[PDB]
Amino acid sequence: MFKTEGPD
Amino acid sequence: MFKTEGPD
Amino acid sequence: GAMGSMERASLIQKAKLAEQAERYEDMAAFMKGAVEKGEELSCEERNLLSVAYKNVVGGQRAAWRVLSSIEQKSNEEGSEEKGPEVREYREKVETELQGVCDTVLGLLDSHLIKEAGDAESRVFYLKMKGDYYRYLAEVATGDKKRIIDSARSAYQEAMDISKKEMPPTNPIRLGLALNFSVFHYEIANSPEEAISLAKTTFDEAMADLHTLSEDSYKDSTLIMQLLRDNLTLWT
Amino acid sequence: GAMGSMERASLIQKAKLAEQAERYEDMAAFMKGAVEKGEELSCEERNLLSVAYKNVVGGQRAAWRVLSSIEQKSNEEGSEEKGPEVREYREKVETELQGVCDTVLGLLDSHLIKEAGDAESRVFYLKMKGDYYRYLAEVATGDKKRIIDSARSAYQEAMDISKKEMPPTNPIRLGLALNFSVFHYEIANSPEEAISLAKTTFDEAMADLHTLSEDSYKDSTLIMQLLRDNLTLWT
Ligand SMILES: Cc1cn(-c2cccc3cc(C(=N)N)sc23)nc1N
Ligand SMILES: Cc1cn(-c2cccc3cc(C(=N)N)sc23)nc1N
Ligand SMILES: [Cl-]
Ligand SMILES: [Cl-]
Ligand SMILES: [Mg+2]
Ligand SMILES: [Mg+2]
Ligand SMILES: [Mg+2]
Ligand SMILES: [Mg+2]
Q: Is residue D2 assigned to a domain?
A: no
Looking at residue D72, the DSSP 8-state letter turns out to be: H
Residue C210 is given by DSSP the state: G
Question: How many domains does chain C divide into?
Answer: 1
Chains with 3 or more CB pairs closer than 8 angstroms to B? C
Residue D235 to residue A2: CA distance in whole angstroms: 13
CATH number, domain containing residue D65: 1.20.190.20
φ and ψ of D42, to 5 deg: -75, 175
DSSP D86-143: HHHHHHHHHHHHHHHHHHHHHHIIIIIHHH--SHHHHHHHHHHHHHHHHHHHHH-SST
d(CA D197, CA D156) in angstroms, rounded, equals: 12
**Ion ligand 7: protein residues whose beta carbon lies under 5 Å:** D 94
User: Which amino acid makes up residue C19?
Assistant: E
**Using the 8-state DSSP alphabet, how is residue D14 labeled?**
H
Nearest by CB to residue B5, choosing from C179, C233, C234, is C179
Asked if residue D54 belongs to a domain, the reply is yes
Residue-range definition of the domain harbouring residue C75: 8-235
Exposure string of C89-127, with b = 16+ CB inside 10 Å and e = fewer, is: bbebbbebbeebbebbbebbeeebbeebeebbbbbbbbb
Residue nearest to atom 18 of ligand 1 (CA): C44
Going by C-alpha positions, the residue among D47, D6, D19, D60 that lies closest to residue C63 is D19
Are B4 and C51 in contact (CB < 8 Å)?
A: no
Method: X-ray
- Chain C hits for B8, CB-CB cut-off 8 Å, are 54-55, 58, 62
Resolution in A: 1.6
Q: How far is C78 from chain D (nearest CA, A)?
A: 20
| Burial of residue B8 (number of CB atoms within 10 Å: 0-12, 13-18, 19+) | exposed
C38's torsion region: left (phi>0), alpha (psi -120 to 50) or beta?
Answer: left
Residue D94, ligand 2, Cβ within 6 A: no
**Alpha helices (runs of H) in C166-213, residue ranges in sequence order:** 171-182, 191-206
Residue D77 lies in a domain: yes
Distance CA C184, CA C166 (A): 22
Cα of D225 from ligand 3 centre, angstroms:
38
DSSP category for residue C142: S
Is residue D65 a part of any domain in this protein?
yes
Alpha-carbon dihedral sign for residues D18, D130, D176, D45: negative
Which chain D residues are within 8 Å of C23, Cβ to Cβ?
63, 93
Preceding omega of D111 cis (within 30 degrees of 0): yes
Which residues approach ligand 1 with their CB closer than 6 A? C 19, 43-44, 47-48, 51
Asked if residue C210 has a cis previous peptide bond (ω within 30° of 0), the answer is no
Centroid of ligand 7 to alpha carbon of A1 (angstroms): 22
> Would you say residue C2 lies in a domain?
no
Q: State whether D50 and A2 contact (CB < 8 Å).
A: no
Report angle CA C8, C121, C183 to the nearest 5 degrees. Answer: 115
Show which of residues 1-8 on chain B sit within 8 Å of chain C, judged by CB atoms: 2-8
Q: C51 contacts in B (CB within 8 Å)?
A: 6-7
For residue D22, the SS3 value is: coil
DSSP string, D157-222: HHHHHHHHHS-TT-HHHHHHHHHHHHIIIIIS--HHHHHHHHHHHHHHHHTTGGG--HHHHHHHHH
Mutate to test the pocket of ligand 1, among C47, C49, C176, C215 (most ligand atoms within 8 A of CB): C47
Q: Note whether residue D194 is domain-resident.
A: yes
Is C3 inside a domain boundary? no
The residue contributing the CA closest to ligand 2 atom 8 is D47
**Amino acid sitting at position C160:** D
Q: Which amino acid is at C33?
A: G
Amino acid sitting at position D70 = I
Is C1 within a domain? no
- Rounded to whole angstroms, the Cα distance separating D7 from C40 reads 49
